[PDB]
RNA sequence: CCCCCCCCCCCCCC
């Protein structure tokens, strides 16, 4: 009885982490970066996307990534993409005639977005009294962070479906980015958000670049109010892909009686093993599903189904479940759990 | 159920703190400093803003920051700007025929301020009996500190709004700065406070410079009453942007019964996690919102709606809430906590 | 196989 122990999940994690062989992916592909000396240039484009109405927003995500490249530096971004498991060579961007030339992003798109911005600015200046503030202009230094805030909104909804991600991005951007939607009325959150989702699907090393930018920005001593907003949304993205662990600790806090069930008590050992694996991985365990790290799925609580049923029932009783489409394996446990959770929530008690 | 534990907030701070990459911003920008060799000159300017009635008070904040630069030194100020995450290139200050040519400050403005002060001095010397005391003249050595005191008053309200900040600055400066107002009858605290708010919003690295001056002044072995007043106000700004944590420890000190409610006791774990993160950051945690450090927002108690509602209710019962504009998520807890806090306040019990 | 919900922050007085 005492000596019959397995510790399967610790062995699996040790098997995965202890490889001395590294696999090279994206071996023949080249991405684009913009050197920090061109920050002031890419601050213009990142704004000329916002304050005008464009037919196409296809490469707006790449433009935000170019701003991230300028913020970190071309050499540091190359190192970030090389330490991210991708053998992607990096191409520098060139200013020509001034305008920008970015690898991959066609120059027709750049010249079109610039021309639309110029025409809109002329229309808004001629018909007005020549009075446009500093924060209503594409030159403003917080426009790239506004684009990256749309990107960070779509970043949180990366473990979800594209349609759900776009819906949530639009809803949360009409609130979070209310000031920007006052200063730049013509910015199209659906299309910019869909561009960011497309980028984060096609280029997975750019998830790592985005995460490094979030780290660097949060480590900064000072920042504008847009950078603080970006960091807040980025931290809202932290636990993405592992809401079941969060609702499990929530079920423990709620003291759900059906956690004492026979099946839940039978599965608590493997549950604690999953949580111990989370602790053993450490601070990077939250970014596993964001990075699309193959090591994720070691943190799934799927093989313990009755604990998951009880946890989803507790969440439903608390009303927290929302529209979470996760499967409920056993329905009886789920129903009893939500009954008790609602009964506890309704009653007001003092300890 | 002992192992069902996550510790998300510590992991988020670990990610933000453990960054191997440094951000780069304001790359192509420059700012002005004034060497200590010009302090005796900048003092004059910093006082010629105070005893005359000027049409434009646009750059008074820049003149206060110039005096700070004279105090710390040009090289130390450049280092301070560099370690604040901003790659602003310091531009030195020169003299011309003497007056100052400060970078980014129009010479027309400096000439206007000097001429207005000279005309006012001539008018108050010709009509009056010619008994101007040593403290009433512009070349007084505490005038730069008197201007920086208005700056420090508006500094304590950088987390608040502009209108609240200006109203509070004027209200508090009629009493905090009564002696300076007597010495300089015509000093416009509203316009100078507006100038300082504009500087703090536009140039965020000057928040770091202003904090470094506060530290270099508080660490001094001796000081005048003006510098002691400035340090008093600067320390009154310490917990800016985090009044919810202060009110939470107030509620715990008040032994509010609704802290023992079921939901409050449910959220107390992560509340204590936030306080542990506060202790982990240490002395510089208070200056996070003043600096607009993007790392601020890890200290938010918005993810504990019931604890926040109880804290706000306790504050409202004790009369501390004043006119606080935060949200009360759970109104029943807020009202119950307010009732208990009023009941405890009314009763006078001595042990 | 796995994932799937919601959610910027701040705001008083001295």
Numbering used by the authors:
A (entry chain B), B (entry chain A): 3 to 99, 112 to 365
What does the paper say about this structure?
The viral genome is encapsidated in a sheath of oligomerized copies of the nucleoprotein N, forming a ribonucleoprotein complex termed nucleocapsid. The nucleocapsid is the template for transcription and replication by L, which is also dependent on the obligate polymerase cofactor, the phosphoprotein P, together forming the active L/P holoenzyme. In oligomerized and RNA-bound N (N-RNA) the nucleic acid is threaded along an extended groove in between the NTDs and CTDs of laterally connected N protomers. An important function of the C-terminal domain of P in nsNSVs is to bind to assembled N-RNA, forming an N-RNA/P complex.
We decided to apply this to two neighboring N protomers of a 10-mer, following 5-fold symmetry expansion and local refinement. We observed that local refinement of an N-RNA dimer yielded higher quality maps as evidenced by the improved anisotropic displacement parameters (ADPs) of the model, especially in the NTD region. Variability analysis of the dimer revealed a notable motion, especially of the NTD, given by a marked transverse tilting movement of N by ~4°, with respect to the center of mass of the protomer. The tilting motion occurs around a pivot point between NTD and CTD of N. As a consequence of the motion, the NTDs globally move away from each other by ~2 Å (maximum displacement up to ~5 Å at the periphery of the NTD) at the endpoint vs. the starting point of the variability component. While the importance of the N-terminal and C-terminal arms of N has been well established in this role, we observed an additional mechanism of lateral N-N interaction. In all frames of the variability component, the loop ranging from residues 232-239 of the Ni protomer inserts into the neighboring Ni-1 protomer (red loop in Fig. 2C). The loop of N is hooked into position from the top and bottom by residues P308 and R27 from the Ni-1 protomer, with residues S243 and E241 providing additional stabilization through H-bonding. Mutagenesis of P308 to alanine resulted in a notable decrease of polymerase activity, while the R27A mutation nearly abrogated polymerase activity, suggesting that the N-N interaction via the 232-239 loop may be involved in controlling nucleocapsid assembly. In summary, our data point towards a critical lateral interaction between N protomers via insertion of the loop from residues 232-239, which stays consistent throughout the motion of assembled N protomers. Our data also suggest that residues P308 and especially R27 play a key role in this lateral interaction.
